[PDB]
Each structure stands twice: as C-alpha cells, then as structure tokens.
Design an enzyme around this catalytic site. Structure first.
Site, PDB file in Angstrom:
ATOM      1  N   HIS A 137       4.755  11.690  -5.721  1.00 32.48           N
ATOM      2  CA  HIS A 137       3.638  11.183  -6.512  1.00 32.48           C
ATOM      3  C   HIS A 137       3.586   9.670  -6.498  1.00 32.48           C
ATOM      4  O   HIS A 137       4.571   8.969  -6.153  1.00 32.48           O
ATOM      5  CB  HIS A 137       3.759  11.618  -7.973  1.00 32.48           C
ATOM      6  CG  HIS A 137       5.095  11.337  -8.579  1.00 32.48           C
ATOM      7  ND1 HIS A 137       6.067  12.302  -8.701  1.00 32.48           N
ATOM      8  CD2 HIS A 137       5.629  10.195  -9.077  1.00 32.48           C
ATOM      9  CE1 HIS A 137       7.140  11.772  -9.263  1.00 32.48           C
ATOM     10  NE2 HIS A 137       6.902  10.493  -9.499  1.00 32.48           N
ATOM     11  N   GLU A 184      -4.421   3.270  -0.485  1.00 32.77           N
ATOM     12  CA  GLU A 184      -5.238   3.354   0.682  1.00 32.77           C
ATOM     13  C   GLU A 184      -5.578   4.808   0.857  1.00 32.77           C
ATOM     14  O   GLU A 184      -4.703   5.640   1.119  1.00 32.77           O
ATOM     15  CB  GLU A 184      -4.464   2.851   1.893  1.00 32.77           C
ATOM     16  CG  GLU A 184      -5.068   3.296   3.206  1.00 32.77           C
ATOM     17  CD  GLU A 184      -4.244   2.834   4.372  1.00 32.77           C
ATOM     18  OE1 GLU A 184      -3.305   2.031   4.196  1.00 32.77           O
ATOM     19  OE2 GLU A 184      -4.524   3.262   5.485  1.00 32.77           O
ATOM     20  N   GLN A 225       0.764  -1.248   0.000  1.00 31.34           N
ATOM     21  CA  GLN A 225       0.000   0.000   0.000  1.00 31.34           C
ATOM     22  C   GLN A 225       0.798   1.303   0.000  1.00 31.34           C
ATOM     23  O   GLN A 225       1.940   1.377   0.456  1.00 31.34           O
ATOM     24  CB  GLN A 225      -0.921   0.018   1.214  1.00 31.34           C
ATOM     25  CG  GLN A 225      -0.162  -0.122   2.510  1.00 31.34           C
ATOM     26  CD  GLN A 225      -1.057  -0.067   3.737  1.00 31.34           C
ATOM     27  OE1 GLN A 225      -1.770  -1.037   4.043  1.00 31.34           O
ATOM     28  NE2 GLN A 225      -1.015   1.066   4.463  1.00 31.34           N
ATOM     29  N   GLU A 229       2.030  10.514 -12.074  1.00 30.11           N
ATOM     30  CA  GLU A 229       2.796  10.365 -13.303  1.00 30.11           C
ATOM     31  C   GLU A 229       2.054   9.396 -14.203  1.00 30.11           C
ATOM     32  O   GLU A 229       1.575   8.363 -13.735  1.00 30.11           O
ATOM     33  CB  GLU A 229       4.158   9.796 -12.981  1.00 30.11           C
ATOM     34  CG  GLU A 229       5.238  10.036 -14.001  1.00 30.11           C
ATOM     35  CD  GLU A 229       6.536   9.468 -13.492  1.00 30.11           C
ATOM     36  OE1 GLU A 229       7.334   8.897 -14.269  1.00 30.11           O
ATOM     37  OE2 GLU A 229       6.739   9.525 -12.270  1.00 30.11           O
TER      38      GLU A 229
HETATM   39  O1  LIG Z   1      -3.539   9.426   9.979  1.00 27.58           O
HETATM   40  C1  LIG Z   1      -4.755   9.874   9.793  1.00 27.58           C
HETATM   41  O2  LIG Z   1      -5.013  10.772   9.011  1.00 27.58           O
HETATM   42  C2  LIG Z   1      -5.817   9.170  10.603  1.00 27.58           C
HETATM   43  C3  LIG Z   1      -5.346   7.882  11.242  1.00 27.58           C
HETATM   44  N1  LIG Z   1      -5.300   7.893  12.536  1.00 27.58           N
HETATM   45  N2  LIG Z   1      -4.839   6.765  13.218  1.00 27.58           N
HETATM   46  C4  LIG Z   1      -4.825   6.808  14.671  1.00 27.58           C
HETATM   47  C5  LIG Z   1      -3.428   7.004  15.178  1.00 27.58           C
HETATM   48  N3  LIG Z   1      -2.792   6.239  16.005  1.00 27.58           N
HETATM   49  C6  LIG Z   1      -1.495   6.717  16.209  1.00 27.58           C
HETATM   50  C7  LIG Z   1      -0.553   6.164  17.068  1.00 27.58           C
HETATM   51  C8  LIG Z   1       0.702   6.760  17.178  1.00 27.58           C
HETATM   52  C9  LIG Z   1       1.713   6.192  18.101  1.00 27.58           C
HETATM   53  F1  LIG Z   1       2.696   7.022  18.192  1.00 27.58           F
HETATM   54  F2  LIG Z   1       1.272   5.998  19.384  1.00 27.58           F
HETATM   55  F3  LIG Z   1       2.199   5.039  17.645  1.00 27.58           F
HETATM   56  C10 LIG Z   1       1.014   7.886  16.428  1.00 27.58           C
HETATM   57  C11 LIG Z   1       0.087   8.453  15.572  1.00 27.58           C
HETATM   58  C12 LIG Z   1      -1.172   7.868  15.481  1.00 27.58           C
HETATM   59  S1  LIG Z   1      -2.541   8.377  14.556  1.00 27.58           S
HETATM   60  C13 LIG Z   1      -4.389   5.559  12.540  1.00 27.58           C
HETATM   61  O3  LIG Z   1      -4.055   4.569  13.149  1.00 27.58           O
HETATM   62  C14 LIG Z   1      -4.434   5.590  11.076  1.00 27.58           C
HETATM   63  C15 LIG Z   1      -4.041   4.458  10.354  1.00 27.58           C
HETATM   64  C16 LIG Z   1      -4.165   4.439   8.975  1.00 27.58           C
HETATM   65  C17 LIG Z   1      -4.676   5.539   8.305  1.00 27.58           C
HETATM   66  C18 LIG Z   1      -5.053   6.681   9.005  1.00 27.58           C
HETATM   67  C19 LIG Z   1      -4.930   6.726  10.393  1.00 27.58           C
HETATM   68 ZN   LIG Z   2       8.094   9.049 -10.932  1.00 30.45          ZN
HETATM   69 ZN   LIG Z   3      -2.136   1.881   5.918  1.00 22.12          ZN
END
Ligand SMILES: O=C(O)Cc1nn(Cc2nc3cc(C(F)(F)F)ccc3s2)c(=O)c2ccccc12
Ligand SMILES: [Zn+2]
Ligand SMILES: [Zn+2]
EC number: 4.4.1.5
Lengths: 177, 176
Positions: free
Chosen positions: A122, A95, A29, A168
């Site tokens: 990209h 994703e 992904q 691209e």
């Molecule tokens: O990313 C987005 O836009 C939304 C988003 N939020 N979160 C929750 C989170 N759990 C965390 C845990 C840590 C830690 F530091 F604790 F590991 C650090 C940062 C984060 S964010 C996700 O787990 C996540 C996974 C895939 C795609 C989007 C997200």
């Molecule tokens: Zn390229």
């Molecule tokens: Zn992911």
C-alpha cells in the site's frame, strides 16, 4: 534457529551514513497502474485531496502518466517544459499509469499486491484525525479494507482506491499507541 | 485513444478543506531479507533508517526509511515515532520473519502478470554518475541509462527485484 527478525542492534548495524554523492537524491514517485483515470482522478483529487500536477501522453506507446501530489495548483508552472522540471522535482508524488483502453476492457483488472502473488502492499496518508477522515470517507462511499475501530489495531484504517489498491489512513501523533 | 486533457481535467476536483494537511506519507513493500534491504537503501541509495517497529505476535517487522538527516531523528522513543510518520516520502519495508530462510520464496514486483504496482523512482542530479556508482557497487540493472530510446533514465532493482527508476528532473523534458 527460527527468524525472530533483527534486533535493533543488527538492524542499525546494517545501516550506513549516505554517501555524500547521494545527498540530493529524492524519493520522487510511486507508480501504480490504473484501469480508469476518470475514477482514479475523481478519487484522488475529490476524496483525498491530491492535485493533478501533470498529464503526459505517450502516443507511440499507448499510455499516459498522471502525477498527483499534495501541492497547491497555483505553484504549477503552466508551460510544458517548466511544468515538467517542476513535477519531477517534487517529493512524494503518485504516478498513475493508464495503458489506453483498459477502461473499456471488462476482462481486465490490476492486482493490488495483497494476495497471491504478494509484493507491494500500500501507499499511506497521514491525516490529523483518522475518525473524521473515515467518517468523511464513509459518507462519500469509499470501500474499506479496515475501519479504524475494526480488527486488531484501533485508530488505524485501510481504504481502497478505484482499482483495489490499499491506502493506510494514519495519525502520526498516535501511532506509538 | 487515451483521455483528452479536457476529460481528465474535468474529473479533477479542488481539494476539500477537510483534507488540508493530508500528506503522502508512505509506500509499503514486502521484503525477503532485511539485512540486504537495509544495506541497499542506506549504503547504496542514501536513505536513512528512521525507525523499526516489531510485532512478535504476528512475526513481522516494519522498517521506515527516508531521505532525512539522522540528526533530526528524535531519540525519545515515543517522539521518534511521531516524527517518522509525519515525514513525507517514506518507504515502509515489511519483513515477515522466516522468509529470508526459504529458498522457494520471493515476492512479486508487480511488473509481470498479474501486473499492478510498477516502481518507485528517485530524483537525482546526475543519472550517469549515480549509475556509474550503482554499477561499481554491483547493483543489478533493468535499464541502463544509455539503453533504449529514453536515454538519461535508468531502472535498477533492489534485493527483492522491485524496480527503482532513476531520473534527473532537469533532463526529463528533453528525454521524452
Ligand atoms: O508499464 C506499463 O504499464 C506501461 C509502460 N510501458 N513502458 C514501456 C516499456 N519499456 C520497457 C523497457 C524494458 C527494458 F527491459 F528494455 F528495459 C522493459 C520493460 C519495458 S515496458 C514504460 O516505459 C513505462 C514507464 C512508466 C510507466 C509505464 C510504462
Ligand atoms: Zn503502512
Ligand atoms: Zn515512473
């Protein structure tokens, strides 16, 4: 002395055969944050021809995930746990992460990584013919970063998705040109 | 609130036949040090340098990497290219000559403001062996497999701070 980058010799000298423990690892992904899944879904499926593999919702955390890939929709298991095992073992998926509510927040947009601060650049899609691909794109109203006969390298196009991410558009059998 | 399934699905079109054989070829990251980066992705993660293209006129190199046997890499310099850009699930690493020597310079990983790109993710058969080995080699972690609610899933960082997710596709459904 200034960087004139690595010679191929230095470059390959830094490269190692994969440890055997890594032999079934798979590049699964690329995650991009998207403001509006209606636009993004339309775009990736209708314009570029990806297929929506799975939509996963996280209520507690207030986002959904949309996985897109070039896959035949008849191959997708319809049962939730089976869908999941199948999706996450596909190669080359997108994703798209929708933090709920960004669509109705007119002060919010994401950063494509191509201007300060720079990072990600990209994703890229191999096509059989860039010129018909791009002519088709023009017809459907895709914003261009670079038209194929524009700028320096002719035959190479960059388009934008509904959030501004660069894509691209490339012909693998005519890149060495 | 989120989109209901019905709104999301009704925004999905079948692919136009025109788009037949389009393929998701590459994701591009800008990298500070190509020595560090190539060592990481090959030795640590098990990917293979497919090709290097240089552009002295603009002071940049591109490095292409994939999970591919190096014994499929056509030796013929014209045909190597054609093969490379025809592989799915490739990383294009972009070295802007100079940056490895400028202590004030780092790239933005897209995970702090202004947010955008989040991560790449690598499907593994066993997250714990994978990570135990990452820990052994000194890989820097964001989320260790046991940390937090989602156990069995990890995030590591490459030499630039880009977040790489590590998952077992067979365990995702249990984890979430
Ligand atoms: O990313 C987005 O836009 C939304 C988003 N939020 N979160 C929750 C989170 N759990 C965390 C845990 C840590 C830690 F530091 F604790 F590991 C650090 C940062 C984060 S964010 C996700 O787990 C996540 C996974 C895939 C795609 C989007 C997200
Ligand atoms: Zn390229
Ligand atoms: Zn992911």
């Amino acid at each position: 002395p200034a960087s004139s980058g690595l010679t191929d010799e230095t470059a390959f000298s830094c490269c190692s055969d994969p440890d055997p423990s890594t032999k079934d690892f798979l590049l699964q992904q690329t995650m991009l944050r998207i403001k509006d899944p209606k636009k993004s879904l339309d775009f990736y499926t209708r314009v570029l021809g990806l297929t929506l593999l799975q939509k996963l919702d996280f209520p507690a955390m207030k986002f959904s995930l949309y996985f897109l890939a070039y896959e035949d929709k008849n191959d997708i298991p319809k049962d939730k746990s089976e869908k999941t095992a199948w999706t996450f073992s596909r190669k080359a998926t997108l994703e798209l992460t929708h933090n709920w509510g960004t669509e109705d927040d007119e002060t919010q947009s994401y950063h494509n990584g191509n201007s300060d601060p720079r990072g990600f650049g990209h994703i890229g899609i191999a096509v059989p013919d860039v010129y018909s691909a791009c002519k088709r794109f023009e017809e459907l109203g895709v914003k261009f970063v670079k038209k194929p006969d524009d700028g320096k390298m002719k035959g190479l196009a960059f388009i934008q998705d509904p959030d501004g991410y660069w894509i691209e558009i490339l012909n693998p059998n005519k890149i060495a040109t």
